[PDB]
Design an enzyme around this catalytic site. Structure first.
Site, PDB file in Angstrom:
ATOM      1  N   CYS A 192       0.095   4.540  -0.877  1.00 52.62           N
ATOM      2  CA  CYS A 192      -0.623   5.688  -0.330  1.00 52.62           C
ATOM      3  C   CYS A 192      -0.709   5.602   1.190  1.00 52.62           C
ATOM      4  O   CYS A 192      -0.482   6.588   1.899  1.00 52.62           O
ATOM      5  CB  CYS A 192      -2.016   5.765  -0.961  1.00 52.62           C
ATOM      6  SG  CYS A 192      -3.240   6.758  -0.075  1.00 52.62           S
ATOM      7  N   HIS A 193      -1.033   4.419   1.701  1.00 53.12           N
ATOM      8  CA  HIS A 193      -1.085   4.128   3.129  1.00 53.12           C
ATOM      9  C   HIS A 193       0.163   3.352   3.534  1.00 53.12           C
ATOM     10  O   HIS A 193       1.162   3.368   2.810  1.00 53.12           O
ATOM     11  CB  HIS A 193      -2.364   3.363   3.458  1.00 53.12           C
ATOM     12  CG  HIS A 193      -3.603   4.202   3.395  1.00 53.12           C
ATOM     13  ND1 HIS A 193      -4.088   4.874   4.490  1.00 53.12           N
ATOM     14  CD2 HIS A 193      -4.412   4.537   2.359  1.00 53.12           C
ATOM     15  CE1 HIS A 193      -5.158   5.568   4.144  1.00 53.12           C
ATOM     16  NE2 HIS A 193      -5.385   5.367   2.858  1.00 53.12           N
ATOM     17  N   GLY A 194       0.163   2.755   4.722  1.00 52.19           N
ATOM     18  CA  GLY A 194       1.272   1.903   5.110  1.00 52.19           C
ATOM     19  C   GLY A 194       0.982   0.416   5.023  1.00 52.19           C
ATOM     20  O   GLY A 194       1.795  -0.406   5.454  1.00 52.19           O
ATOM     21  N   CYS A 227       0.859  -1.176   0.000  1.00 48.67           N
ATOM     22  CA  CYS A 227       0.000   0.000   0.000  1.00 48.67           C
ATOM     23  C   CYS A 227       0.897   1.227   0.000  1.00 48.67           C
ATOM     24  O   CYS A 227       1.479   1.551   1.043  1.00 48.67           O
ATOM     25  CB  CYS A 227      -0.900  -0.005   1.228  1.00 48.67           C
ATOM     26  SG  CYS A 227      -2.388   1.005   1.236  1.00 48.67           S
TER      27      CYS A 227
END
Ligand SMILES: CCCCCCCCCCCCCCCCCC(=O)OC[C@H](COP(=O)([O-])OCC(O)COP(=O)([O-])OC[C@@H](COC(=O)CCCCCCCCCCCCCCCCC)OC(=O)CCCCCCCCCCCCCCCCC)OC(=O)CCCCCCCCCCCCCCCCC
Ligand SMILES: CCCCCCCCCCCCCCCCCC(=O)OC[C@H](COP(=O)([O-])OCC(O)COP(=O)([O-])OC[C@@H](COC(=O)CCCCCCCCCCCCCCCCC)OC(=O)CCCCCCCCCCCCCCCCC)OC(=O)CCCCCCCCCCCCCCCCC
Ligand SMILES: CCCCCCCCCCCCCCCCCC(=O)OC[C@H](COP(=O)([O-])OCC[N+](C)(C)C)OC(=O)CCCCCCCCCCCCCCCCC
Ligand SMILES: CCCCCCCCCCCCCCCCCC(=O)OC[C@H](COP(=O)(O)OCCN)OC(=O)CCCCCCCCCCCCCCCCC
Ligand SMILES: CCCCCCCCCCCCCCCCCC(=O)OC[C@H](COP(=O)(O)OCCN)OC(=O)CCCCCCCCCCCCCCCCC
Ligand SMILES: CCCCCCCCCCCCCCCCCC(=O)OC[C@H](COP(=O)(O)OCCN)OC(=O)CCCCCCCCCCCCCCCCC
Ligand SMILES: CCCCCCCCCCCCCCCCCC(=O)OC[C@H](COP(=O)(O)OCCN)OC(=O)CCCCCCCCCCCCCCCCC
Ligand code: HEC
Ligand code: HEM
Ligand code: HEM
Ligand code: HEM
Lengths: 54, 98, 52, 32, 65, 56, 237, 74, 379, 54, 54
Positions: free
Chosen positions: A18-20, A16
């Site tokens: 954009c996220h972690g 991911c």
């Protein structure tokens, strides 16, 4: 829709960006609140050839 | 002590502020209907006027003056014996039906 | 609905209507099985199971 | 005993045009 | 060209809510950089500072725009 | 009084009452829309297309 | 969670309309900054007539674009100048090309972006003006930018607005905050193009209610006065 | 159930006025305001405490929930 | 000679229902919400039919059809948000109406109370299926969660969910059949409301005192037609304040995003008038127990006449049960708030205590407290 | 009635809506129809009142 | 579906893919004709026996 890096992965197979919530070969969230990993659906698992999935 | 709790609850129920008696407010089911039908005429007429007056008061969103409020010691349970008899008759018919 | 209906005459009424009630329950069961083609049960009926 | 029956005073609710008992109420009826 | 938002942000940063949150943020910044490997992050501290600053800025910015 | 005259001339008969209501509805729509519009365009003066169109 | 502040927009008030010059400057911002990556599927050129542009100005703005037009006598698709009835051009043929051009992220349609976000134009203003450096301990992948107002605070959109990003026809400095306010006004109109009419109708409704409710109340109480002043007497034998 | 055959009633007299003889808002404030205050004291301790409890519970739940999203140093 | 109002067969029915109907002279503003409900129904049929003149139930066009209604149809935004906020007003009026029935013991009218329970369920089904029709994110995923709830049913859950879908998930077939059901259902609601009024007129209205009012009946027409007109105008004021000053107050921004089966919203909540039930179901860890509780929270209205243990009908002369009633209303408010919140600390324990308390009030506290009040009055 | 210059999309959608709603109005009108009929009962092939043979 | 791009296609879908959809479709289509046959016979009866006197 914070699309992971399909077929690569910083940890495993995806990640991911954009996220972690990076992903392993089992496409497992590494760190994030996404309610689950990539959904693993109903399938006929016997082989990559013989998977009806749906 | 229950003179206290009961008189307190009578005040707090506030049907005395409409000039009503306790038995004026009983839910009218069939047993209560027969109890009212057996009532002597003067009692029936008093009850009907008290209920009409209270309906008018609550239509105007009003209460009586405090001097006119049913005082707790003078609340007459005028319908209790009639209801008790109707209920006893019903219980008798059911005890027979068994 | 607690004990007004609790008595000798009411147990006699219950026993009188139990065969009719059980027959009606069997009627409901058979109708439900047939309407839905419930194979679970219907796979046991000798000739009817030919449909499956 | 029916002669013992008096209409209560309605002055508190009356329109000002009809507060006087000594006046014709026709003279305000149209206006009312 | 100068933007209103810059000067409004500085003036609102001179706010004691901002003044307190800024050094809370700089103590987080002094920890997380000292500690070699952690899970923190100073996003919460920055969020406090930005909440204060942007409340003041939303009060004063549209007057010059 | 004025209201006595209004009742005697326009309200007593239901047909004339209704005609007064119809004529009043027409004139009320005109005047009420005119006033409400002027209020709305004063509250929002210079902000609307109409106020600024004459530059384009 | 960093929630947007409340900005004193010209249209926040209950009867307060949108400033239409800001809507016009905001169309210029969308049509010169956003449109290369965002579509506005439900807003057409004709919609801008009587709002922020005259019909001639809007027809020339439609002429500025080329739009694909349906099959010819030979069965080919062609390119024609745009029309008033034409909707705003789409920057990408499909979502997949949009995601391919923007590092996996699909940039949303902006017809309803103000309505489809909690916080609305306040959120959009704070998002556009809120790009800061990542805080200590925060690291973002390349192609991601720290924005404290975006959920997750990692947005795939680079800062679009800056000082003098465009030129405004009426001559305003195009400072970043000015550009953001203009585009946010335009986006509020693009989500809710009935805003001004809705509020004018609200003013009329409030006036009509302030007249009718007292009048219907007087009608009810005129009919009910018979019951409410009524006197009762009990004269038993 | 129609008018004329609802109950037996006896010895009850009613006096009413025409609506054109009386007003529609008599003593609307001089009497209405004390009546609203009386009707408010009569019920306020029966209605209000549950909503006070909801306010407190809502306030506590919201502030607590937001007190969990805060970083605890660890 | 006759009065055709009384002799004509149609006008006779109308006359007996709304003109010469004997009505209690003291029924309060709370008795207005019946006439509001029937007005809301009519409004929903009126705007919806005009929405259905432009709306299309194919998943490729539903969201676009609604945008077209609100952007290009003349006064289509008016009709659309009048319809949405009229659904919200419908449920406000329904909740107030059922609360009045509970407070004043109106459930002692068994047939009209039970028909009212049926009506509550049918209005809920209509509103649920209507909210899917715009095919926004909330439309799609709310349909997804609420329909997959039915898989908890033993032995036939998956089969019945798939049959309702017409497929393997919520999709095109589900949207089109939901449009058809949403169209037809309000007319069945109209028929049930007619049956409801038929059962009510058998006894007439109850009043705030809970005492039979036959000695003080007034004709319906002049008094309650004008009072119901005033109530309708006030309701229209609130509705138009919503439609013209905060169209989106009671809605959700994520339904302005077209449905994305790939991406789910961070929060999937029903509409506000479902949250109290969504809280109760979410309080129970067990899927089927949760569904059973979400159904019992509305089926328990059928139990109120059997739970009545007071000698009096209404709550007017019973302070302790008024206290419990307002606690019940507060618990419903806290269930709505909890259902609008994530399933995390502390809203979980709060929702659990509220869900327990709702049933503990209706089923236990209210009966025992009526018995205590009975003895305090020495009967 | 068209909603436009010719028979087109607007006409089709509104015709679907009116077509859905109208048979329910017909149902109500048939109920009123029977209400009016039962005030006299049915006519019969002779055209003579038959109350002596109901 | 009442959109002009899908109405004909939706009806074809009903008659070719919906389980027993052609039964329901042609039942509806010929039930309208049966409705009008019955209506014309109903009105003809009314004319012939003087039922219009009601
Ligand atoms: C979702 C919501 C949808 C809409 C719901 C509508 C419900 C019904 C509303 C219409 C209706 O029938 O109202 C009857 C109801 C009673 O009529 P009334 O003749 O005034 O009754 C006087 C009482 O008998 C005795 O009144 P009182 O003497 O106690 O007080 C008199 C007066 C005194 O008030 C003042 O003097 C106010 C001073 C400040 O106050 C009022 O009459 C209240 C009216 C405004 C509230 O009227 C209102 O409540 C009017 C406002 C209605 C809107 C809701 C307000 C709460
Ligand atoms: C002064 C203190 C603040 C205002 C009053 C606070 C309060 O609790 O008053 C209760 C008090 C009613 O106590 P109650 O007479 O035992 O209640 C009878 C029912 O409320 C039925 O009484 P009603 O039929 O004459 O209409 C009054 C009713 C009207 O309710 C509606 O129209 C529906 C409201 C919900 C939608 O509203 C209320 O009683 C509650 C307040 C509603 C919102 C304002 O409210 C009034 O006296 C009438 C409203 C006055 C507003 C000023
Ligand atoms: C319980 C009543 C029987 C329901 C049922 O499953 O009937 C069997 C039939 C056919 O099923 P079947 O008999 O082949 O097997 C039943 C097993 N399940 C339920 C898992 C499919 O069911 C239906 O026809 C539809 C489901 C029930 C609808 C009511
Ligand atoms: C129902 C009755 C509601 C109470 C009355 C409110 C009346 C308010 C009103 O009519 O305001 C005017 C407004 C239209 O305003 P506008 O588009 O400017 O046109 C004015 C004339 N040219 O018209 C409106 O705002 C009408 C809003 C209500 C429409 C639906 C009413 C129920 C059906
Ligand atoms: C708050 C409740 C009232 C709402 C506003 C008024 C609505 C219209 C009522 C009206 O015409 O008059 C109201 C008030 C008192 O009028 P009323 O008591 O009805 O009669 C007096 C004359 N006979 O009289 C006036 O306001 C002046 C009337 C001229
Ligand atoms: C909900 C409301 C539903 C409609 C109300 C139905 C009942 C009233 C309508 C009929 C009516 O008013 O008829 C009265 C009248 C007939 O003649 P008349 O002698 O005045 O009255 C005898 C019968 N009432 O009628 C006429 O004379 C009509 C005169 C022409 C129309 C103006
Ligand atoms: C409502 C706010 C005002 C309020 O609570 O007023 C109290 C008042 C008292 O009314 P009364 O009928 O006189 O009761 C005896 C009082 N000693 O009035 C009442 O208690 C009447 C309120 C109960 C009945 C009307 C409907 C209220 C519905 C509340 C929300 C329900 C939500 C869904 C619940 C299921
Ligand atoms: C060259 C690329 C590019 C430009 C220029 C651009 N955007 Fe975007 N935008 C994106 C991408 C990619 C996303 C997806 C967000 C991630 O996640 C996005 C997302 C957004 C969002 C949604 C954020 C959210 O909460 O989901 C808004 C609002 C937005 N853009 C507005 C604008 C405005 C206003 C402008 C200019 C005045 C603009 N954009 C210019 C690429 C761009
Ligand atoms: C379709 C929605 C509904 C409509 C249109 C409707 C309509 C009405 C109307 C017009 C009245 C008479 C006026 C009044 O007393 O308010 C009434 C009374 C009543 N309704 Fe409803 N109703 C609906 C739903 C319900 C519900 C959900 C319930 C409760 C389960 C219910 C139970 C009652 C009861 C008990 C009464 C009698 C109240 C009394 O006289 O004290 N109804 N209804
Ligand atoms: C019982 C009355 C009704 C209720 C409670 C109801 C409720 C709703 C709701 C909540 C929506 C979603 C509104 C939104 O977009 O946010 C909706 C949509 C819709 N309803 Fe209804 N409805 C009712 C009656 C009707 C009827 C009778 C029709 C058809 C004649 C209809 C046609 C529609 C249409 C076409 C839509 C989609 C357009 C839109 O989303 O606004 N409704 N309904
Ligand atoms: C919606 C379609 C209709 C339905 C469902 C319907 C239903 C009925 C029914 C059930 C009867 C009683 C049984 C019978 O004698 O046939 C009846 C009788 C009658 N209908 Fe219809 N009807 C319809 C249309 C019409 C039409 C178009 C007319 C002509 C104007 C009409 C005039 C009558 C008359 C006059 C009678 C009484 C006949 C007699 O007793 O001699 N109806 N209708």
């Amino acid at each position: 829709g914070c699309v992971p890096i399909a077929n690569a992965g910083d940890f495993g197979g995806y990640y991911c960006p954009c996220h972690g919530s990076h992903y392993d070969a089992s496409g497992r969230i590494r760190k994030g609140p996404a309610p689950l990993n990539l959904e693993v659906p109903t399938y006929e698992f016997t082989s990559d050839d013989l998977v009806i999935v749906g | 002590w229950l003179e206290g709790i009961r008189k307190w609850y009578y005040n707090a129920a506030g049907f005395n502020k409409l000039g009503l008696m306790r038995d004026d407010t009983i839910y009218e089911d069939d047993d209560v209907k027969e109890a009212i039908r057996r009532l002597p005429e003067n009692l029936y007429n008093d009850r009907v006027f008290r209920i009409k007056r209270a309906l008018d008061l609550t239509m105007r969103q009003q209460i009586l003056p405090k001097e006119q409020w049913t005082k707790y010691e003078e609340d007459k349970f005028y319908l209790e014996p009639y209801l008790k008899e109707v209920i006893r008759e019903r219980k008798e018919r059911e005890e027979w039906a068994k | 609905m607690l004990s007004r209906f609790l008595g000798p005459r009411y147990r006699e009424l219950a026993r009188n209507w139990i065969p009719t009630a059980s027959m009606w329950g069997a009627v409901g069961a058979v109708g439900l099985v047939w309407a839905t083609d419930w194979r679970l049960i219907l796979d046991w009926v000798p000739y009817i199971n030919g449909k499956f | 005993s029916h002669t013992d029956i008096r209409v209560p005073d309605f002055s508190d609710y009356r329109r000002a045009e009809v507060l006087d008992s000594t006046k014709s109420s026709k003279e305000s009826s149209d206006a009312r | 060209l100068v933007d209103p938002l810059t000067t409004v942000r500085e003036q609102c940063e001179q706010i004691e809510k901002c003044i307190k949150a800024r050094e809370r943020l700089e103590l987080c910044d002094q920890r997380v950089s000292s500690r070699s490997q952690t899970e923190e992050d100073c996003t919460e501290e920055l969020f406090d500072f930005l909440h204060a600053r942007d409340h003041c800025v939303a009060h004063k910015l549209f007057n010059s725009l | 009084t004025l209201t006595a005259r209004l009742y005697s001339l326009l309200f007593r008969r239901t047909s004339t009452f209704a005609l007064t209501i119809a004529v009043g509805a027409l004139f009320f729509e005109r005047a009420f829309d005119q006033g409400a519009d002027a209020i709305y365009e004063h509250i929002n003066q210079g902000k609307l297309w109409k106020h600024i169109k004459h530059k384009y | 969670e960093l929630h947007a502040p409340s900005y004193p927009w010209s249209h926040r008030g209950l009867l307060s309309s949108l400033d239409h010059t800001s809507i016009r400057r905001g169309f210029q911002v969308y049509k010169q900054v956003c449109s290369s990556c965002h579509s506005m599927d439900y807003v057409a050129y004709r919609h801008l007539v009587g709002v922020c542009y005259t019909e001639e100005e809007a027809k020339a703005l439609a002429e500025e674009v080329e739009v694909q037009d349906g099959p010819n006598e030979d069965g080919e698709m062609f390119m024609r100048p745009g029309k008033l009835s034409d909707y705003f051009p789409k920057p990408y043929p499909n979502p997949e090309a949009a995601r391919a051009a923007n590092n996996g992220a699909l940039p949303p349609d902006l017809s309803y972006i103000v309505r489809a976000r909690h916080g609305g134009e306040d959120y959009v203003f704070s998002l556009l003006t809120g790009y800061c450096e990542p805080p200590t301990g925060v690291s973002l992948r390349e192609g991601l930018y720290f924005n404290p107002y975006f959920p997750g605070q990692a947005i795939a959109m680079a800062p679009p607005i800056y000082n003098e990003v465009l030129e405004f026809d009426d001559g305003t400095p195009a400072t970043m905050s000015q550009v953001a306010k203009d585009v946010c006004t335009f986006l509020r109109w693009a989500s809710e193009p009935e805003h001004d009419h809705r509020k004018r109708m609200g003013l009329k409704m409030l006036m009509m209610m302030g007249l009718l409710l007292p009048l219907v109340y007087a009608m009810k109480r005129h009919k009910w006065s018979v019951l409410k002043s009524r006197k009762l007497a009990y004269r038993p034998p | 159930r129609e008018f004329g055959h609802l109950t037996r009633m006896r010895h009850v007299i009613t006096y009413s006025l025409s609506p054109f003889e009386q007003r529609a808002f008599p003593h609307y404030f001089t009497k209405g305001i004390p009546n609203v205050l009386r009707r408010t004291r009569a019920c306020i301790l029966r209605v209000a405490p549950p909503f006070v409890v909801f306010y407190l519970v809502y306030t506590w739940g919201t502030q607590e929930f937001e007190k969990s999203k805060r970083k605890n140093p660890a | 000679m006759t009065n055709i109002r009384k002799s004509h067969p149609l006008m006779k029915i109308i006359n007996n229902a709304f003109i010469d109907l004997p009505a209690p002279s003291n029924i309060s503003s709370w008795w207005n919400f019946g006439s509001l409900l029937g007005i809301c129904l009519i409004l929903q049929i009126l705007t919806g039919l005009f929405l259905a003149m432009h709306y299309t139930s194919d998943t490729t066009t539903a969201f676009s059809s609604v945008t077209h209604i609100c952007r290009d149809v003349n006064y289509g935004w008016v009709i659309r948000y009048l319809h949405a906020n009229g659904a919200s007003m419908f449920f406000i009026c329904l909740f107030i109406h059922v609360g009045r029935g509970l407070y004043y013991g109106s459930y002692m009218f068994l047939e009209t109370w039970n028909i009212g329970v049926v009506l509550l369920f049918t209005v809920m089904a209509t509103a649920f299926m209507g909210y899917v029709l715009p095919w926004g994110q909330m439309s799609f995923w709310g349909a997804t969660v609420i329909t997959n709830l039915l898989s908890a049913i033993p032995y036939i859950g998956t089969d019945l969910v798939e049959w309702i879908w017409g497929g393997f998930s919520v999709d095109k077939a589900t949207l089109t059949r939901f449009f058809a059901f949403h169209f037809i259902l309000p007319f069945i609601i109209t028929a049930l409301a007619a049956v409801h009024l038929l059962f009510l007129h058998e006894t007439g209205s109850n009043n705030p005192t809970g005492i039979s009012s036959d000695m003080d009946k007034i004709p319906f027409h002049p008094y309650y037609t004008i009072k119901d007109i005033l109530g309708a105008l006030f309701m229209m004021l609130i509705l138009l304040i919503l439609v013209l000053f905060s169209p989106d107050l009671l809605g959700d921004p994520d339904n302005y995003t077209p449905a994305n089966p790939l991406n789910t919203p961070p929060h999937i909540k029903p509409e506000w008038y479902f949250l109290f039930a969504y809280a109760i179901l979410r309080s129970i860890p067990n899927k089927l127990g949760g569904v059973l509780a979400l159904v019992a929270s509305i089926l328990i209205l059928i139990l109120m006449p059997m739970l009545h243990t007071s000698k009096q009908r209404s709550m007017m002369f019973r302070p302790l049960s008024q206290c419990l009633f307002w606690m019940l209303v507060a618990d419903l408010i806290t269930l709505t708030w909890i259902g609008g919140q994530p399933v995390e600390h502390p809203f979980i324990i709060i929702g659990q205590l509220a869900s327990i308390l709702y049933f503990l009030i209706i089923l236990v506290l209210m009966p025992i407290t009526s018995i205590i009040e009975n003895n305090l009055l020495k009967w």
